[PDB]
Amino acid sequence: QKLIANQFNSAIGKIQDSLSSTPSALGKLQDVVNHNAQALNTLVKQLS
Amino acid sequence: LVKNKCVNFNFNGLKGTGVLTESNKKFLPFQQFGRDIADTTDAVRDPQ
């Protein structure tokens, strides 16, 4: 029980670093955001 | 010159409709109009 609990706790502790450290970790959600922004900016720029 | 109120305006033939406000744009003596990314005049130097 104690070893399993400690392994879980250390693994959960490393998630903060893994997300914050590797830049392209949230890349799928950032991709959604960027696609919307890019499409609207393209629409605006097409008015010229 | 009416400011801060939606008006039809005509500046040296540049016709439009909107609210005119005092600007902080740093124009240069050879510039009469300022343009946005859509190629729409969004800042104008008053002729007089």
Side-chain angles (χ1 to χ4, degrees), chain A residues 10-13 15-16 18-20 23 25-30:
Chain A
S10 35
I12 220 76
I15 295 302
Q16 277 256 86
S18 79
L19 303 158
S20 107
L26 278 307
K28 294 160 105 318
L29 307 184
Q30 196 56 62

Side-chain angles (χ1 to χ4, degrees), chain A residues 44 47-48, chain B residues 37-38:
Chain A
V44 169
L47 283 175
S48 70
Chain B
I37 37 163

Side-chain angles (χ1 to χ4, degrees), chain B residues 15-23 25 27-30:
Chain B
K15 294 158 111 153
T17 301
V19 171
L20 307 158
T21 49
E22 54 264 80
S23 181
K25 263 47 170 320
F27 281 29
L28 315 175
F30 72 89

Side-chain angles (χ1 to χ4, degrees), chain A residues 1 3-13 15-16 18-20 23 25-48:
Chain A
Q1 191 164 331
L3 157 77
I4 288 161
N6 283 359
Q7 287 176 308
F8 164 80
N9 293 346
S10 35
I12 220 76
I15 295 302
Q16 277 256 86
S18 79
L19 303 158
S20 107
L26 278 307
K28 294 160 105 318
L29 307 184
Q30 196 56 62
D31 283 356
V32 170
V33 173
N34 298 341
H35 277 109
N36 162 273
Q38 173 169 243
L40 284 182
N41 181 260
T42 297
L43 218 45
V44 169
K45 216 157 280 224
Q46 274 299 95
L47 283 175
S48 70

